[PDB]
Amino acid sequence: DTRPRFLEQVKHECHFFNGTERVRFLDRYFYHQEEYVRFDSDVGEYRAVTELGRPDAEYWNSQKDLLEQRRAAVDTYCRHNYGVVESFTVQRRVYPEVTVYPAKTQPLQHHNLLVCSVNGFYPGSIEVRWFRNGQEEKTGVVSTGLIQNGDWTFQTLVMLETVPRSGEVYTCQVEHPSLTSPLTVEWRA
Amino acid sequence: EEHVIIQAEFYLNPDQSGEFMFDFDGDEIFHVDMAKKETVWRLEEFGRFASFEAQGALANIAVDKANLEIMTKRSNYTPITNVPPEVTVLTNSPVELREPNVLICFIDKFTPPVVNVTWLRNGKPVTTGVSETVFLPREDHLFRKFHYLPFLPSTEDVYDCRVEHWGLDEPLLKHWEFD
């Protein structure tokens, strides 16, 4: 199927700073990926983002009643919907399950990678650090980065390249808004 | 900067495919099943704390369809350029033999929002237990999508997520097996 496709998108965005203390409403219109006209509550009128949207800005900006609907949206729409959702979104808190398992950088004889797997947490911001005998190991640390699972949880793997010796204790430490003190998981050779 | 709530809509010709959803910080809160005119909550717990009149979503789609005809003509019928997806296959948690788990197929950075996705086990399509999200919007106005496959990890099975998209020359197959 090679028939040409045509795509319209609209994104009505509500941006919140310090809860509902400062709110910015953005009404954005797109043709394929190209934003062509927008209403910004910082401006109070539509503005063409490309020449494609100049007829819409001119036309909509002539309609004072349309504009007053858009100018009220920070209150009637953004602040309202924040109130509806805030308890299970803004305040959603899911702590991570933390696993440490060994692995290999390449097919080798001995495990030379320690994987700290951090799973199922929300929200996204997290800090994961590796310790050897109580000193932080900053070298040879590599990660998947932050992964969205698409179901309101995140995961990340944080790997430490090391050759483990007997008598060493390795500690993965996880800090996250859902935790009141660092979560630690140890691994011994 | 703290948080962003987006009412995202799209309409696609000639497919006459529409979508209406709400996103919070990159996660879907709900979408409206256009055919059934029903609100579909991304997590069930959401539907016990809030409601949405799904019928109102259809009015937005109708305006979006009308705007699309206008913009299509204004553009001198300039069509979309296909952007093929990046595809990643991962599991929901560390893999343990015989311990139930979920394969996730993450399909990212593509447009238009039309894709065919198949899970394969040992090269054969599997349908039992699978689920998927709608097309999720990106800040660069491309799309992403998730497909899921609950499974029991064994040494005997290999998996693939197979993705077809008009920007791909051949189907994309992303492999997973027990290490």
Partner: peptide
């Protein structure tokens, strides 16, 4: 506890 949608603006023909 009721979600509010906002309408999309209609261009002119």
């Amino acid at each position: 506890d009721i979600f509010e949608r906002i309408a999309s603006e209609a261009s002119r023909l």
